[PDB]
Design an enzyme around this catalytic site. Structure first.
Site, PDB file in Angstrom:
ATOM      1  N   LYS A 173       1.339  -1.600  -0.371  1.00 24.34           N
ATOM      2  CA  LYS A 173      -0.417  -0.305  -0.094  1.00 24.34           C
ATOM      3  C   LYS A 173       0.598   1.878  -0.179  1.00 24.34           C
ATOM      4  O   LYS A 173       0.075   3.100  -0.424  1.00 24.34           O
ATOM      5  CB  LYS A 173      -1.218   0.392   1.507  1.00 24.34           C
ATOM      6  CG  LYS A 173      -2.072  -1.191   2.027  1.00 24.34           C
ATOM      7  CD  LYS A 173      -2.726  -0.985   2.763  1.00 24.34           C
ATOM      8  CE  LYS A 173      -1.534  -1.189   3.577  1.00 24.34           C
ATOM      9  NZ  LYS A 173      -1.538  -1.828   4.257  1.00 24.34           N
TER      10      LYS A 173
ATOM     11  N   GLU B  27       2.439   6.358  10.424  1.00 23.44           N
ATOM     12  CA  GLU B  27       3.532   4.756  10.185  1.00 23.44           C
ATOM     13  C   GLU B  27       4.335   5.203  10.400  1.00 23.44           C
ATOM     14  O   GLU B  27       4.342   6.314  11.244  1.00 23.44           O
ATOM     15  CB  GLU B  27       2.824   5.197   8.428  1.00 23.44           C
ATOM     16  CG  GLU B  27       1.820   4.768   8.066  1.00 23.44           C
ATOM     17  CD  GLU B  27       2.268   2.869   8.245  1.00 23.44           C
ATOM     18  OE1 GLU B  27       2.832   2.849   7.586  1.00 23.44           O
ATOM     19  OE2 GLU B  27       0.873   1.866   8.402  1.00 23.44           O
ATOM     20  N   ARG B  28       5.312   5.083  10.553  1.00 23.75           N
ATOM     21  CA  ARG B  28       6.683   4.598  10.855  1.00 23.75           C
ATOM     22  C   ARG B  28       7.339   6.139  10.295  1.00 23.75           C
ATOM     23  O   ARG B  28       7.213   6.516   9.724  1.00 23.75           O
ATOM     24  CB  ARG B  28       7.551   3.441   9.726  1.00 23.75           C
ATOM     25  CG  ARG B  28       6.740   2.536  10.568  1.00 23.75           C
ATOM     26  CD  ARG B  28       7.392   0.675   8.963  1.00 23.75           C
ATOM     27  NE  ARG B  28       6.915  -0.397   9.366  1.00 23.75           N
ATOM     28  CZ  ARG B  28       6.125  -0.743   8.306  1.00 23.75           C
ATOM     29  NH1 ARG B  28       5.795  -0.085   7.479  1.00 23.75           N
ATOM     30  NH2 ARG B  28       5.683  -1.462   8.484  1.00 23.75           N
TER      31      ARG B  28
HETATM   32  N1  ADP Z   1       6.206  -2.878  -6.921  1.00 23.35           N
HETATM   33  C1  ADP Z   1       5.749  -3.998  -5.995  1.00 23.35           C
HETATM   34  N2  ADP Z   1       5.096  -4.980  -5.885  1.00 23.35           N
HETATM   35  C2  ADP Z   1       5.603  -5.970  -5.068  1.00 23.35           C
HETATM   36  N3  ADP Z   1       5.465  -5.679  -4.022  1.00 23.35           N
HETATM   37  C3  ADP Z   1       6.393  -4.963  -3.109  1.00 23.35           C
HETATM   38  C4  ADP Z   1       6.539  -3.688  -4.629  1.00 23.35           C
HETATM   39  N4  ADP Z   1       6.651  -2.709  -3.459  1.00 23.35           N
HETATM   40  C5  ADP Z   1       6.799  -3.489  -2.074  1.00 23.35           C
HETATM   41  N5  ADP Z   1       6.908  -4.708  -2.282  1.00 23.35           N
HETATM   42  C6  ADP Z   1       6.162  -5.349  -1.194  1.00 23.35           C
HETATM   43  O1  ADP Z   1       5.960  -5.029  -0.585  1.00 23.35           O
HETATM   44  C7  ADP Z   1       5.741  -5.154   1.157  1.00 23.35           C
HETATM   45  C8  ADP Z   1       5.534  -3.819   1.885  1.00 23.35           C
HETATM   46  O2  ADP Z   1       6.280  -2.534   1.419  1.00 23.35           O
HETATM   47  P1  ADP Z   1       5.325  -1.668   1.356  1.00 23.35           P
HETATM   48  O3  ADP Z   1       4.254  -1.012   0.020  1.00 23.35           O
HETATM   49  O4  ADP Z   1       6.109  -0.261   2.375  1.00 23.35           O
HETATM   50  O5  ADP Z   1       4.444  -1.990   3.082  1.00 23.35           O
HETATM   51  P2  ADP Z   1       2.119  -1.283   3.986  1.00 23.35           P
HETATM   52  O6  ADP Z   1       2.137  -1.846   2.534  1.00 23.35           O
HETATM   53  O7  ADP Z   1       2.793  -2.495   4.669  1.00 23.35           O
HETATM   54  O8  ADP Z   1       2.528  -0.368   3.286  1.00 23.35           O
HETATM   55  C9  ADP Z   1       7.424  -5.171   0.924  1.00 23.35           C
HETATM   56  O9  ADP Z   1       8.186  -6.352   1.724  1.00 23.35           O
HETATM   57  C10 ADP Z   1       7.846  -5.489  -0.529  1.00 23.35           C
HETATM   58  O10 ADP Z   1       7.907  -6.605  -0.756  1.00 23.35           O
HETATM   59 MG    MG Z   2       3.273   1.325   5.012  1.00 22.42          MG
END
Ligand code: ADP
Ligand code: MG
Lengths: 52, 147, 55, 54, 351, 55, 254
Positions: free
Chosen positions: E36, E62-63
């Site tokens: 996200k 968030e962080r």
């Molecule tokens: N373009 C992408 N496609 C698929 N997975 C991704 C992509 N970018 C990051 N990720 C995966 O999403 C995980 C969480 O990313 P992030 O978006 O920062 O966290 P969250 O969605 O929980 O806030 C990471 O471990 C990474 O491997």
């Molecule tokens: Mg996040």
């Protein structure tokens, strides 16, 4: 017998479809005249709607 | 307005029989169903133009009424009927050609009808003739019948 | 249960969402079959004659 | 003979795989019904204890 | 305001099956650790530099690390400028180290700056909010000391009123227009929780992410059979885009019911007619995955941006059968359909 | 197929020919002639034998 | 409008957001909670709103009031608190699924779980005659829907039961914002339930229907005035409709 009726079959066929071509073009001028009287009311209704 | 009727588009008018051209006759019925609904979409008379309420509601005068004076006495010329006659012209030539079966095959009917008269004559008695039976069943020149 | 609107009824795509034995047996059978079709479609893709003239 | 021997054993072995899957489907229906009641009971106590201590 | 448009982004899953709109509220669902924050980092990359007006980023709960990887990925791209008066982005930050009375008034402070540009000026504003589940949760902590009986699973009794009091200021009025993208955390993969399942009434386009797609390697993991839009409409997107979108969902949903047979029968015992609708569906799953630009440090691959007219023409030809002579791997992480055959030959020669 | 797949380990060098795509459609007499023709014109001239099946 | 001899219709969109806006008012007034923190009188909240819909008699005016409430379930669980209050009050439900919406069936009405307990006493005489067999024909199809994925070695009756069930389904699909008339509805059902479609290809049933409806509006307008005004379908109209769908089906594919 079958070739006597083959004479008469083409003379009732032809006079039906040669008047369908009369009336298929006849509807083409009514719906373009009815939409001519209607459209000239539409673009004067826009000015009756704008200034208010 | 004006609106004339037509004939039945039931059996003949979709069976014009071109050189395997049932598609052109199918398109001929498809224009009659489309234009009859477009004639059913709009009526013969349009809406009426109220003139008295135009003067008070649009009471900034001059520019409102001058368009309403010029568009009131206008005329709408409909399109020409130049293609209306030439399509009806080819129907007059083909109808004179369609009676050629009624002209030429009429003698072919009576010659076949007269052939049924002489065919009764030939059979006659069982033991009749060796030359009168030599009209239907054939004879030929030297070395025709192989078997 | 299912012979009423109230009770639980199963939809389409419920063996893979469970993720059990049959849900893992289905994923490794769609892959071990469509691995051989990446062989036969790639070996016959080398049979373009214009590439061989370049070779 | 072999396509009759095979097509009859496909009839039996697909029959015991629907008895064992319907014997298993009632035992999970009771556990679903014990657990469905136990969640309405559990989250009812949390609302009562939240209002009583207030 | 009542008018609708289409705002093109360049992502293949988003523009095909659930198109976004100018001046419309957009939601990004999904659990924890599916993407996200990266997908909301992608729309600042594409949309915010080609946009005329300004932009506001409110980060709520968030962080505190990730508010520094935004301040250092917006100086080196020149969006924030530290030397003169030509910047285009404001930032409002209340993170997850704050007391819980301060994670519930930051989102009201984000859309107060973004209300000045729409009202006192006339520009087209964007607004990015991540996260917005931490507005509901931070009010469920101060609640029991204010003297309120709890509702269902633990939220406050005034849950759906103060949510609907904030979400009625993020709108397009007759004085401006606010595009808004929002990330919405779904707690432990359950969209029936009372905090995510009441935001659905305030969103036009929902993009439901999923962990069951992301664990295949299909990235971005967007669920095609769970994402909607209000402008998927053949009078708005034309009749050619409309019969392509529903043609993709119909072959994916019919692929779901076929997996129940392969688990008992097998793949080879199927007929030849539905060995083809599987192989057409598997190429549609893999063609939706696109290599992102800001995920270069994860992948090493390059950033692609497929236009709208090419996304439809790529998917007509897999459905009609013009690419039945390629294996499945030729579509994984590609851009337009032109690179799907260039990648097909390069795999062939290494046999 | 499933005769060859079982015996692929212990007796992979004692096979003569293997006939697949059997059992989907019902068997006919033409398929009993296709198999028996290729048992002759192979190059293996044998002198006894036996057949095993499920009556 | 019910008190003054007229007719009416009302739509609550939706009733599952009234039980939530009332629960907040209860728990802030310190009332004793219950299941899912709803008060003890949420049944008394919805009952005295739906019981106001009534069919009055001729001595009071002959008015009416029809009520359609909308209820949103969560994950298709109708056994919750509020989805079981409003089910036991009203008469019948229309259950729209999400699986059929993406399989092509739009509007996605599940007729396996949808009922109405006024029954056939609210249908006209024309619609009642054809749909009584259609309801029996579709219900025999849903028994044998699980044999369609691998079925070619079945009886010719079972192949027929699959053949009519697919083609009756394509008549039920309908685009948005296109409501039809009852006289046009009974003609399309009459074309399907008789047997005039078992040779047409299942993908063409939509194109055949839009072609056939625009025909009978312009070229058979005097038959759709003798089912609208008559109310029933007689023996004279049974033969007159019979050659119509045989004339159109003969030359159709062009
Ligand atoms: N373009 C992408 N496609 C698929 N997975 C991704 C992509 N970018 C990051 N990720 C995966 O999403 C995980 C969480 O990313 P992030 O978006 O920062 O966290 P969250 O969605 O929980 O806030 C990471 O471990 C990474 O491997
Ligand atoms: Mg996040």
């Amino acid at each position: 017998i079958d070739l006597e009726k083959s004479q008469q079959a083409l003379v009732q066929k032809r006079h039906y479809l040669f008047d369908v071509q009369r009336n298929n073009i006849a509807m083409a001028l009514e719906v373009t005249y009815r939409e001519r009287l209607h459209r000239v009311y539409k673009e004067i209704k826009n000015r009756l709607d704008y200034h208010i | 307005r004006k609106l004339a009727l037509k004939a039945i588009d039931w059996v003949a008018f979709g069976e014009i029989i071109p050189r395997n051209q049932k598609a052109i006759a199918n398109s001929l019925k498809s224009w009659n169903e489309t234009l009859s609904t477009r004639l059913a979409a709009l009526p013969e008379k349009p809406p009426a133009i109220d003139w008295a309420y135009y003067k008070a509601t649009v009471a900034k005068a001059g520019l409102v009424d001058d368009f309403e004076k010029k568009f009131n006495a206008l005329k709408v010329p409909v399109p020409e009927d130049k293609y209306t006659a030439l399509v009806d012209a080819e129907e007059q030539e083909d109808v004179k050609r369609c009676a050629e079966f009624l002209s030429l095959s009429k003698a072919r009917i009576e010659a076949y009808e007269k052939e049924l008269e002489k065919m009764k004559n030939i059979i006659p008695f069982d033991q009749m003739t060796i030359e009168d039976l030599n009209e239907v069943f054939p004879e030929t020149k030297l070395d025709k019948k192989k078997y | 249960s299912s012979d009423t609107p109230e009770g639980v009824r199963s939809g389409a795509g419920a063996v893979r969402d469970a993720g059990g034995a049959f849900g893992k047996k289905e994923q490794a059978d769609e892959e071990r079959y469509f691995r051989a079709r990446a062989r036969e479609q790639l070996a016959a893709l080398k049979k373009h004659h214009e590439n061989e003239i370049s070779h | 003979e072999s396509t009759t021997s095979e097509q009859s054993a496909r009839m039996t072995a697909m029959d015991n795989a629907s008895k064992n899957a319907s014997e298993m489907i009632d035992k999970l229906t009771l556990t679903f019904n014990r657990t469905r009641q136990a969640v309405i009971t559990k989250e009812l106590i949390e609302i009562i204890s939240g209002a009583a201590a207030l | 305001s009542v008018e609708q448009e289409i705002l093109v982004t360049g992502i293949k899953v988003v523009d095909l099956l659930a198109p976004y709109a100018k001046g419309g509220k957009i939601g990004l669902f999904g659990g924890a650790g599916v993407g996200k924050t990266v997908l909301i980092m992608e729309l600042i990359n594409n949309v915010a530099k080609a946009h005329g007006g300004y932009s506001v980023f409110a980060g709520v709960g968030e962080r505190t690390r990730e508010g520094n990887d935004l301040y250092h990925e917006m100086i080196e791209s020149g969006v924030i400028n530290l030397k003169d008066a030509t910047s285009k982005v404001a930032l409002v930050y209340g993170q997850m180290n704050e007391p819980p009375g301060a994670r519930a008034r930051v989102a009201l402070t984000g859309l107060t700056v973004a209300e000045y540009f729409r009202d006192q000026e006339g520009q087209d504003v964007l607004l990015f909010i991540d996260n917005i589940f931490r507005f509901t949760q931070a009010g469920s902590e101060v609640s029991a000391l204010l003297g309120r009986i709890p509702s269902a699973v633990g939220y406050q009794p005034t849950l759906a009123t103060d949510m609907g009091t904030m979400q009625e200021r993020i709108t397009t009025t007759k004085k401006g227009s606010i595009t808004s993208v929002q990330a919405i955390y779904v707690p432990a993969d359950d969209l029936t929780d009372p905090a995510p399942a009441t935001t659905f009434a305030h969103l036009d386009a929902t993009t439901v992410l999923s962990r069951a797609i992301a664990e295949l390697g299909i990235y971005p993991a967007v669920d095609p059979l769970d994402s909607t839009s209000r402008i998927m409409d053949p009078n708005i997107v034309g009749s050619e885009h409309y019969d392509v979108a529903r043609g993709v969902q119909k072959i994916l949903q019919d692929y779901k019911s076929l997996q129940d047979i392969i688990a008992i029968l097998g793949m080879d015992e199927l007929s030849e007619e539905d060995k083809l609708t599987v192989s057409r569906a598997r190429k549609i799953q893999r063609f939706l995955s696109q290599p992102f630009q800001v995920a270069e440090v994860f992948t090493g691959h390059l950033g692609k941006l497929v236009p709208l007219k090419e996304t439809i023409k790529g998917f007509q030809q897999i459905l009609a059968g013009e690419y039945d002579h390629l294996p499945e791997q030729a579509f994984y992480m590609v851009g337009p359909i032109e690179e799907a055959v260039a990648k097909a030959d390069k795999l062939a020669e290494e046999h | 197929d499933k005769i060859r797949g079982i015996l692929h380990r212990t007796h992979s060098d004692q096979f003569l020919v293997t006939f697949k795509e059997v059992g989907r459609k019902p068997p006919t007499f033409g398929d009993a002639s296709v198999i028996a023709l290729e048992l002759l014109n192979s190059g293996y001239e044998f002198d006894e034998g036996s057949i095993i099946f499920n009556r | 409008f019910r008190d003054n001899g007229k007719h009416a219709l009302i739509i609550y969109d939706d009733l599952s957001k009234q039980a939530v806006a009332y629960r907040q008012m209860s728990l802030l007034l310190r009332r004793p909670p219950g299941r899912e923190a709803y008060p003890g009188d949420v049944f008394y909240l919805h009952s005295r709103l739906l019981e106001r819909a009534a069919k009055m008699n001729d001595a009071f005016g002959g008015g009416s009031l029809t009520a359609l409430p909308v209820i949103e379930t969560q994950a298709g669980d109708v056994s919750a608190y509020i989805p079981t209050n409003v089910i036991s009050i009203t008469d019948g439900q229309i259950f729209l699924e999400t699986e059929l919406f993406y399989k092509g069936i739009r509007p996605a009405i599940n007729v396996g779980l949808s009922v109405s307990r006024v029954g056939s006493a609210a249908q006209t005489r024309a619609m009642k005659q054809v749909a009584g067999t259609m309801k029996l024909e579709l219900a025999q199809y849903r028994e044998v829907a699980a044999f369609a994925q691998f079925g070619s070695d079945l009886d010719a009756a079972t192949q027929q039961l699959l053949s009519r069930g697919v083609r009756l389904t394509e008549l039920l699909k309908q685009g948005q914002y296109a409501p039809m008339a009852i006289e046009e509805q009974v003609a399309v059902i009459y074309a399907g339930v008789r047997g005039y479609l078992d040779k047409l290809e299942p993908s063409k049933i939509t194109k055949f229907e839009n072609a056939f409806l625009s025909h009978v509006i312009s070229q058979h307008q005097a038959l759709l005035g003798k089912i609208r005004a008559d109310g029933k379908i007689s023996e004279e109209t049974d033969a007159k409709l019979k050659e119509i769908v045989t004339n159109f089906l003969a030359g159709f594919e062009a």
